[PDB]
Specification:
78 residues, alpha+beta, 3-stranded antiparallel β-sheet, PTS system glucose-specific EIICB component, phosphotransferase, phosphotransferase system, sugar transport, transferase
């Protein structure tokens, strides 16, 4: 699931707004019908916040751990 979890929201390139940054991403959209943010926050990023109107994602603190999981995905799907 982890190699498809990040895909579930960050891989929805269709997204209308996204604030990618050093260790901070964001995903302001209405495709929440069934999104796995609850997983994409502790598994894709390191803490996100949902605010009807926009969504914010933060891969700080345990950035290396989460990014390590990211590295695994491309290596698992290379």
């Amino acid at each position: 699931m982890a190699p498809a979890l990040v895909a579930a929201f960050g891989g929805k390139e269709n997204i209308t707004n996204l604030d990618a940054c050093i260790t901070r991403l964001r995903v302001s959209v209405a495709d929440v019908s069934k999104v796995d943010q609850a997983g994409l926050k502790k598994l894709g990023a390191a803490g996100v916040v949902v605010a009807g109107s926009g969504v914010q994602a933060i891969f700080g603190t345990k950035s290396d751990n989460l990014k390590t999981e990211m590295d695994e995905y491309i290596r698992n799907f290379g």
